[PDB]
């Protein structure tokens, strides 16, 4: 975010972040980071979740083009420069940067693709500078009639209105999955408690139950574990690599045996399907 110079939108820059603790209050408390809007995760919760690998895609666009950076949204930058997949979880942070990328004479360091034969696939970068073909006759390396240069330079200038001011955009994409997470949110560990009804939080996986030692042999890469109902019943302790079995806390049905209240008000209680030494 404090990088002096961002890359062009057509050749957008990508950085991989993993194996560290991430605090999102650092980005949140800065005033200039105006457009901080996230799909699939509420921003306030970023302080608690745990991610496997995260990607930061950085570029610079026009002010009105920010609305085109969205899943399922069509746009010039969406069609030919940068398309967000529909099933995308993650946030976008766009903020005005007129103070850095605008020249009174004119800035020409940033370019965007204008013509392409086909729409870009999600998270696809195309750096081809070939002369776009618009007619039946081949271009043959000549940018004549019906032969156009798909790259156009953004002529940012400070005198422009807000509609054309340069905007720096960083898209954070989360690889939220069952894989062993390494991008860890700010949270403190706790000693392991076993054989009782506890509220557990394993790498952002909330639950309530009893944690017991299990004989299941997880594959060295296999992190979680499920059952026929597709719920996490076997888990792996992130701090120390052991396999724990999760059992729902003791519950059951309670019924009341009672004669008519007309004759008496004494009652008896039947706990269904449980030996009452464990009541």
């Amino acid at each position, epitope marked *: 975010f404090n990088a*002096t*110079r961002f890359a062009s939108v057509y050749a957008w820059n990508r950085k991989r972040i993993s194996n560290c603790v991430a605090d999102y209050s650092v980005l949140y408390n800065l005033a200039p980071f105006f457009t901080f809007k996230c799909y699939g995760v509420s921003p306030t919760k970023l302080n608690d979740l745990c991610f496997t690998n995260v990607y930061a895609d950085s570029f610079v666009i026009r002010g009105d083009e920010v609305r085109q950076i969205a899943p399922g949204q069509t746009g010039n930058i969406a069609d030919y420069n940068y398309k967000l997949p529909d099933d995308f979880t993650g946030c976008v942070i766009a903020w005005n940067s*007129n*103070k*850095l*990328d*605008s*020249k*009174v*004479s004119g*800035n020409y*360091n940033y370019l965007y693709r204008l013509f392409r034969k086909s729409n870009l696939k999600p998270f696809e970068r195309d750096i081809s500078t070939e002369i776009y073909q618009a007619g039946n006759k081949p271009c043959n390396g000549v940018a004549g009639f019906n032969c156009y240069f798909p790259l156009r330079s953004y002529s940012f200038r*400070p*005198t422009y209105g807000v509609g054309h001011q340069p905007y720096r955009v960083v898209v954070l994409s989360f690889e939220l999955l069952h894989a062993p997470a390494t991008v860890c949110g700010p949270k403190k560990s706790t000693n392991l408690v076993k054989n009782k009804c506890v509220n557990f939080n394993f790498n952002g996986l909330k639950g309530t139950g009893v944690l017991t030692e299990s004989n299941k042999k997880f594959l060295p890469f296999q992190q979680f574990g499920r059952d026929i109902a597709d719920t996490t019943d076997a888990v792996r302790d992130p701090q120390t690599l052991e396999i724990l079995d999760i059992t729902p806390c003791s519950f059951g049905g309670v019924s009341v045996i009672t004669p008519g209240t007309n004759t008496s008000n004494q009652v008896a209680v039947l706990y269904q399907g449980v030996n009452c030494t464990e009541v």
Partner: antibody, heavy 123, light 108 residues
Framework: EVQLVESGGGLVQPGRSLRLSCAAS????????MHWVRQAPGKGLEWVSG????????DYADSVKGRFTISRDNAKNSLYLQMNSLRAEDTALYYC????????????????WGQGTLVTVSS | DIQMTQSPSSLSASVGDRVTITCRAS??????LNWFQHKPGKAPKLLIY???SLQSGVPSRFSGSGSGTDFTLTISSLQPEDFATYYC??????????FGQGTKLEIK
């Protein structure tokens, strides 16, 4: 905390030429632009020249065009400014300003400066 | 062309006073100015850049306000280490990086 050393000043006959050198060591010099500005002994600041992070965009003051030239060596992290065709109005102080951005003509301001070197142009 | 004016030139105050200085711009230039503290004995320093964006590393006593042509700097504390001249410089107009005339500030 960045440090800016400026050297090459002294006494010179008007009409001669000389060199001013400014070296920085407190930050990454490859991605920051620099400028040369003048503080008159009895008048306020006024911009002289400036160069970007790389030698692509260059500019000069209106009364200064065609007289002084600037250079930038990123290998040893320094920049040079040549005094040419000096007269009696160039006996002021020079400051080696560091730009916030990367280009030369931007709303970006000057962040950190250092102690300048005193020059005078007289017989 | 651009012209800038500074109504105050020399002002008097004390250690525990609050003072303000203003700058005027000939034409509207979208509030893109920076404000400089120039100590006569050492290197001058940036205090605020842009309209009201405080530069990190300086006390927050100084406050900037105003957009368009008239801009105002305010000192609420006036510490005994503020014997300097204050400058307001523009970076928007076609004439690049023109500076203003000096503003002496002292306490008596």
């Amino acid at each position: 905390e960045v440090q800016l050393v400026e050297s090459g000043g002294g006494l010179v006959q008007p009409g001669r030429s000389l060199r001013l050198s400014c070296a920085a060591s407190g930050f990454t010099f490859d991605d920051y632009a620099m400028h040369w500005v003048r503080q008159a002994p009895g008048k306020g600041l006024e911009w002289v020249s400036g160069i970007s992070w790389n030698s692509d965009s260059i500019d000069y003051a209106d009364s200064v065009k065609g007289r002084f030239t600037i250079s930038r060596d990123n290998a040893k992290n320094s920049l040079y400014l040549q005094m040419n065709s000096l007269r009696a109005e160039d006996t002021a102080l020079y400051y080696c300003a560091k730009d916030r951005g990367y280009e030369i003509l931007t709303p970006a301001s000057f962040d950190y400066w250092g102690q300048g070197t005193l020059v005078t142009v007289s017989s | 062309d651009i012209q800038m004016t500074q109504s105050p030139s020399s002002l008097s105050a004390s250690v525990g006073d609050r003072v303000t200085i203003t700058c005027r711009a000939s034409q509207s230039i979208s509030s893109y100015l920076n404000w400089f503290q120039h100590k006569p004995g050492k290197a001058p320093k940036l205090l605020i850049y842009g309209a009201s964006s405080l530069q990190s590393g300086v006390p927050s006593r100084f406050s900037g306000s105003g957009s368009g042509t008239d801009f105002t700097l305010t000192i609420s504390s006036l510490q005994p280490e503020d014997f300097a001249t204050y400058y307001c410089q523009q970076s928007y107009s076609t004439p690049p990086y023109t500076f203003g005339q000096g503003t002496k500030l002292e306490i008596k």
